Amino acid sequence: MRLGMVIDLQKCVGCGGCSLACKTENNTNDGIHWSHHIATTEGTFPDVKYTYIPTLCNHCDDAPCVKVCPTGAMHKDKRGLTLQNNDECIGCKKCMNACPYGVISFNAATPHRRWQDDSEVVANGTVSPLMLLKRTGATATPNENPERGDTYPMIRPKRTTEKCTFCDHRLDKGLNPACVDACPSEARVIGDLDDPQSKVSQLIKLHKPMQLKPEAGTGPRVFYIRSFGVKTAY
Amino acid sequence: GAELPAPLRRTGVGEWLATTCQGCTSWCAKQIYVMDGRALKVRGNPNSGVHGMSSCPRQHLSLQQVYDPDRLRTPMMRTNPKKGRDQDPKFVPISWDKALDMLADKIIALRVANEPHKYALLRGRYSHINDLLYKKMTNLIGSPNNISHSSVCAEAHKMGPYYLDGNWGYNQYDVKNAKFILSFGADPIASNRQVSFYSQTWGDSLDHAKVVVVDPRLSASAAKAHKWIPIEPGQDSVLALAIAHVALVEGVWHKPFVGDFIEGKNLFKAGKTVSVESFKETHTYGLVEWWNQALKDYTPEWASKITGIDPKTIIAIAKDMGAAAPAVQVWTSRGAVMQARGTYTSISCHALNGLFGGIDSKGGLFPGNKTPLLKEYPEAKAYMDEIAAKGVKKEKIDQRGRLEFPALAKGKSGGGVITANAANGIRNQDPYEIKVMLAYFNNFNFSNPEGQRWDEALSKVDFMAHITTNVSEFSWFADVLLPSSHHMFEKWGVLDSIGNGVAQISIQQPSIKRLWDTRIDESEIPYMLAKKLADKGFDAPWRYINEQIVDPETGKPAADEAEFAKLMVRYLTAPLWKEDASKYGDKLSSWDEFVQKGVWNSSPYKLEARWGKFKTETTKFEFYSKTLEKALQSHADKHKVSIDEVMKACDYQARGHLAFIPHYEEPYRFGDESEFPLLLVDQKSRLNKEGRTANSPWYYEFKDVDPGDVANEDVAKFNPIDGKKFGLKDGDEIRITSPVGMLTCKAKLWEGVRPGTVAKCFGQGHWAYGRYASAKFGVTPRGGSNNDLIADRYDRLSGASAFYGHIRVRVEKV
Numbered sequence A: 001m002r003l004g005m006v007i008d009l010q011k012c013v014g015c016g017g018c019s020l021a022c023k024t025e026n027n028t029n030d031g032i033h034w035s036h037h038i039a040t041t042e043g044t045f046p047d048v049k050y051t052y053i054p055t056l057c058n059h060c061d062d063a064p065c066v067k068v069c070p071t072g073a074m075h076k077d078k079r080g081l082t083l084q085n086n087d088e089c090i091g092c093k094k095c096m097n098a099c100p101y102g103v104i105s106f107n108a109a110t111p112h113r114r115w116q117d118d119s120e121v122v123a124n125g126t127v128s129p130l131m132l133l134k135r136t137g138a139t140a141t142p143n144e145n146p147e148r149g150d151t152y153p154m155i156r157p158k159r160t161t162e163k164c165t166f167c168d169h170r171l172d173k174g175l176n177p178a179c180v181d182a183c184p185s186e187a188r189v190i191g192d193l194d195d196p197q198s199k200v201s202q203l204i205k206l207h208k209p210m211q212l213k214p215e216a217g218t219g220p221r222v223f224y225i226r227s228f229g230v231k232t233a234y
Numbered sequence B: 001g002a003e004l005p006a007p008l009r010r011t012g013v014g015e016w017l018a019t020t021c022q023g024c025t026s027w028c029a030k031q032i033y034v035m036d037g038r039a040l041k042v043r044g045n046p047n048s049g050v051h052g053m054s055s056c057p058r059q060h061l062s063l064q065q066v067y068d069p070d071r072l073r074t075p076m077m078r079t080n081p082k083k084g085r086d087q088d089p090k091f092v093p094i095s096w097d098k099a100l101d102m103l104a105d106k107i108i109a110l111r112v113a114n115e116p117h118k119y120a121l122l123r124g125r126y127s128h129i130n131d132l133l134y135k136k137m138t139n140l141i142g143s144p145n146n147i148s149h150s151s152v153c154a155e156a157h158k159m160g161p162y163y164l165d166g167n168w169g170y171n172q173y174d175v176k177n178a179k180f181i182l183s184f185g186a187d188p189i190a191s192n193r194q195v196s197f198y199s200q201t202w203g204d205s206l207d208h209a210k211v212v213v214v215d216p217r218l219s220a221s222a223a224k225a226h227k228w229i230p231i232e233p234g235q236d237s238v239l240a241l242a243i244a245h246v247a248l249v250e251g252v253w254h255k256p257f258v259g260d261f262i263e264g265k266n267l268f269k270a271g272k273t274v275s276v277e278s279f280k281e282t283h284t285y286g287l288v289e290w291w292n293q294a295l296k297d298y299t300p301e302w303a304s305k306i307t308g309i310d311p312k313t314i315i316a317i318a319k320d321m322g323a324a325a326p327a328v329q330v331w332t333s334r335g336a337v338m339q340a341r342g343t344y345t346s347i348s349c350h351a352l353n354g355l356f357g358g359i360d361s362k363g364g365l366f367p368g369n370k371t372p373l374l375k376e377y378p379e380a381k382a383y384m385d386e387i388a389a390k391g392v393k394k395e396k397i398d399q400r401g402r403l404e405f406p407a408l409a410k411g412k413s414g415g416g417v418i419t420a421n422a423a424n425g426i427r428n429q430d431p432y433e434i435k436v437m438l439a440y441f442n443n444f445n446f447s448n449p450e451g452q453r454w455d456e457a458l459s460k461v462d463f464m465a466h467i468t469t470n471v472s473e474f475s476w477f478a479d480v481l482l483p484s485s486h487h488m489f490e491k492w493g494v495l496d497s498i499g500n501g502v503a504q505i506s507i508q509q510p511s512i513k514r515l516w517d518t519r520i521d522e523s524e525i526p527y528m529l530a531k532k533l534a535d536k537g538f539d540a541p542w543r544y545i546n547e548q549i550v551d552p553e554t555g556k557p558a559a560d561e562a563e564f565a566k567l568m569v570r571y572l573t574a575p576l577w578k579e580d581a582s583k584y585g586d587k588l589s590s591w592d593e594f595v596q597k598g599v600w601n602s603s604p605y606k607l608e609a610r611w612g613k614f615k616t617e618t619t620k621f622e623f624y625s626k627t628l629e630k631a632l633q634s635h636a637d638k639h640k641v642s643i644d645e646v647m648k649a650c651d652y653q654a655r656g657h658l659a660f661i662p663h664y665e666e667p668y669r670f671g672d673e674s675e676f677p678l679l680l681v682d683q684k685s686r687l688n689k690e691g692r693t694a695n696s697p698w699y700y701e702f703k704d705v706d707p708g709d710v711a712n713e714d715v716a717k718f719n720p721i722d723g724k725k726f727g728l729k730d731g732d733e734i735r736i737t738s739p740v741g742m743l744t745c746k747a748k749l750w751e752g753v754r755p756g757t758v759a760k761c762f763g764q765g766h767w768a769y770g771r772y773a774s775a776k777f778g779v780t781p782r783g784g785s786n787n788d789l790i791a792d793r794y795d796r797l798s799g800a801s802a803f804y805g806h807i808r809v810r811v812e813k814v
């Protein structure tokens, strides 16, 4: 089994809804976005092209992040996912240097520290981050998703790395990744690339698949098909 | 950190509760996922026939609005009697009873002094239960000054649809079946009125639709289009008119809709008049007169001289649209039409929807489907006392209907609101002083052009109360703050949406326990105020509510605030769930089923439904708008002048027949071009939930999803040509100055900007709202406030405020 994702760039509108859904699903600290993007503007006015490429962990066939991890925290599971036992992460950052894609973040900052602020912009009138935390019963942020804790820390400790887990906790329940469900055009499809009848396997036969940095030799399993833009008419 | 055993796992087991998002007037039906009493996720309501589970990205930002750490948790009163940008209100907490006591005393004092018309109700956003607070309460008090925000929104965009085909309203666009899409400034995968549905369909449609996007900036939509036309701001109608000209010369109008020459031969020859009797129109009126009076001379060469567009491109577009007809749809955005002469851009662009037959056709555009949703509570005439009956006849504070403010909504002189001009009436006490103001869900100091006029106006209002979740810029001038329960998570409401060939009606319902000591703006607050007014001897509102707004099943009035909140929605939606709505769409068996599904869908639109029966003077699609002539004649007769004198007084170039046909108005411009060499291209952020996500950190984290923009910054985008001219580099702190104001932000050089323009998102520049939205709350803004640059100007025929085309600016490094 080799789970992967096919992203249809023609359907993609570059809105970031996938990345925002990932924020709500996975309780990433402010500034940490497991789902992100690469956008490019090419050409000189008036012949200007803008492209947006959604990015995430490519859950690589030959993941260098796994190979360099000195503790075995970073590992492959039987679905082909690259997952992390965060409890064994010593924050050495070797995975980040090994990953060609820059999709791993390091929790140098205490996650959700801004929610410890109890100052009020209007005293005894407006509330505060800390007061909202108390009111809602949340631990770190009122937006924290407890589901995440099924398989991974809801709130990661400082001095550990983290990245896209392919919403493994949702897959375990037979559900879709949050970013897949969040996409208005259904541009994102996941499945088993080892199953020739899976939608993803058929998509990369119907369309020419493209990968990010295949030259790095990791065998990424996020495939991009079609074109964000179209050739200019007239 | 072991994985949890299956019986203790939590993924997927929480509850989804239906509501409606209002980040834009897409008004998408949603479900909220709730676990441990907290809202954790938002998704499109799968039952929605307009958009299904599809959503734009802003649905997720909703979660940082309800859980905004700068929300008000209590009513407050200011303790500084002075008001102003420089005056700290020194708000102190008070009770709801005391806050409403203060407001009630001020309202009653007006009535005792026989000046109830000096009360004003200001409405920003709203739901369809607004009639009570907005209209009924206001009129029962005795005021005509229920002032919506519509004219700072898009009223100019309704002029074409109304005066050509009788639709004072918006259209849905049949993208799934379109063969040609021409967008004058619309960016439907980022803004406009079904971002979820048009994002769902846009990329797929490129395989069967040729898409041209006309916008001074390379928008997301233009980036996914076959042609980006980087129009000079304010020149859109030039292209629309030249396309129509070529369509006639080439003989490729849509004959089943328009008609044809009686003898078959195409007699439209460039520059030369045609006999009206030689053409037989089918469902249109005025084609030959339009040609003879103007269109015969709107050649591709004429258009190329003005716009720089290659005439071969104009010609090819016209022919492509002819071949695609009637699967042709022309969009207009605020950018094209919210200009001082923009009524005729709406008309000129929308005329193409008639000429190519797209109006009410497959692949074209058409109005929202009929639904049985009620939009008003019962008549209140029997509850109007003599004080109120006299007061409601006073001239409105926004001066609508004066010679220079025809505001011809639905064909009526003074028919339309003039939101931005209410500040001018207030600050000039013309027609009279406003002494008591209640405002909700609005921030006109920030959202209206030259909003410092609202600073001035509100500082002159004896008593104002603001119904709001956050202390925004408008709130700074309030005597009393009335904190609102959040519309999307803590409120009973009802909204609608159109798209995908259907109209839907969706519920808003509380999905969490109310966080703070807030009340629902449109139901609980007017209910509580009516009780307070009755306690103080003015019980007409209370009697009206208790006798007219009663449960549709039990006939009983609400027992308390919370029951009333739901009752307001039950009352208006009863035609959907108490009655059989099968004739219009879904059959719902009960209120509970309506709440559980969360949405009612109409049947699919019947194509060509309106052909031959438009609500125009002629019942035709009017290229020569006898409908607009009648409205202008009414306004002219009211003011004892000619129509031409109205045009002159309203600063349009049109004279004679040109007042009634698609024609070229040179765009109004303000300021010396040599001092102010750049034209502002105001745009929305695709992460703006109107003016309401600037206090959401995720907004900034992903701000570069706006093409050309920069995460965690407020940038103005310049073409590199102008960057070199003005010595600007990426990241430079800059000041942009217009004749009326200035802002500071950062510079970004981007080739997707037309040279001579500067493209900058509206949405930042808050100095209040919250700690993330401002640098120093109450004092120093984050980013730059676009509307401080935009001179207070109007499309006087519609009442619309102008936000585009006329704004000249200069730039310098700070």
Ligand SMILES: Nc1nc2c(c(=O)[nH]1)N[C@H]1C(S)=C(S)[C@@H](COP(=O)(O)OP(=O)(O)OC[C@H]3O[C@@H](n4cnc5c(=O)[nH]c(N)nc54)[C@H](O)[C@@H]3O)O[C@H]1N2
Pocket: B023, B024, B025, B026, B153, B154, B183, B184, B185, B186, B187, B190, B191, B192, B193, B195, B214, B215, B216, B217, B219, B231, B232, B233, B234, B235, B236, B332, B333, B334, B335, B336, B681, B682, B683, B684, B685, B686, B687, B688, B689, B690, B691, B804, B805
């Ligand atoms: N993301 C987001 N979407 C929204 C909203 C929001 O706040 N955020 N608000 C909703 C509401 S209330 C409204 S009324 C609608 C408005 O939706 P629309 O009427 O479609 O237009 P705007 O979103 O206001 O965008 C203005 C666009 O016009 C462009 N433009 C500016 N000047 C000119 C010009 O002279 N000519 C031409 N051709 N284009 C010009 C700008 O570049 C910009 O792309 O959007 C709704 N959709």
Ligand SMILES: Nc1nc2c(c(=O)[nH]1)N[C@H]1C(S)=C(S)[C@@H](COP(=O)(O)OP(=O)(O)OC[C@H]3O[C@@H](n4cnc5c(=O)[nH]c(N)nc54)[C@H](O)[C@@H]3O)O[C@H]1N2
Pocket: B123, B124, B125, B149, B152, B153, B154, B334, B440, B441, B442, B443, B444, B446, B447, B448, B449, B467, B468, B469, B470, B471, B472, B473, B484, B485, B486, B487, B488, B521, B682, B683, B684, B689, B690, B691, B692, B762, B786, B787, B790, B803
């Ligand atoms: N330069 C520029 N100006 C614009 C636009 C643009 O594109 N460019 N867009 C214009 C358009 S199309 C519109 S329609 C207008 C809208 O303009 P406004 O109607 O003034 O809307 P907002 O700016 O969103 O302010 C709404 C305010 O309600 C408060 N509030 C926030 N959330 C809630 C809630 O849940 N309940 C209640 N009771 N109050 C709440 C806050 O005070 C908030 O500032 O802005 C417009 N101004």
Ligand code: SF4
Pocket: A007, A011, A012, A013, A014, A015, A016, A017, A018, A019, A054, A182, A183, A184, A185, A186, A187, A188
């Ligand atoms: S949600 Fe879908 S359309 Fe939006 S950026 Fe992500 S992949 Fe693209």
Ligand code: SF4
Pocket: A056, A057, A058, A059, A060, A063, A064, A065, A066, A082, A098, A099, A100, A101, A102, A103, A104, A163, A218
């Ligand atoms: S994308 Fe990077 S983090 Fe993800 S599996 Fe590949 S090497 Fe590892």
Ligand code: SF4
Pocket: A065, A068, A069, A070, A071, A072, A073, A074, A084, A088, A089, A090, A091, A092, A093, A094, A095, A096, A160, A161
């Ligand atoms: S930072 Fe953690 S996951 Fe990465 S290599 Fe070091 S121990 Fe392994």
Ligand code: SF4
Pocket: A018, A021, A022, A025, A026, A034, A035, A056, A057, A163, A164, A165, A166, A167, A168, A177, A178, A179, A180
């Ligand atoms: S698969 Fe899940 S973890 Fe990965 S980017 Fe999508 S939402 Fe984030």
Ligand code: SF4
Pocket: B021, B022, B023, B024, B025, B026, B027, B028, B055, B056, B057, B058, B059, B194, B195, B196, B689
């Ligand atoms: S912000 Fe507008 S388009 Fe986006 S989900 Fe909300 S209502 Fe729909």
Ligand SMILES: [Mo]
Pocket: B152, B153, B154
């Ligand atoms: Mo609007």
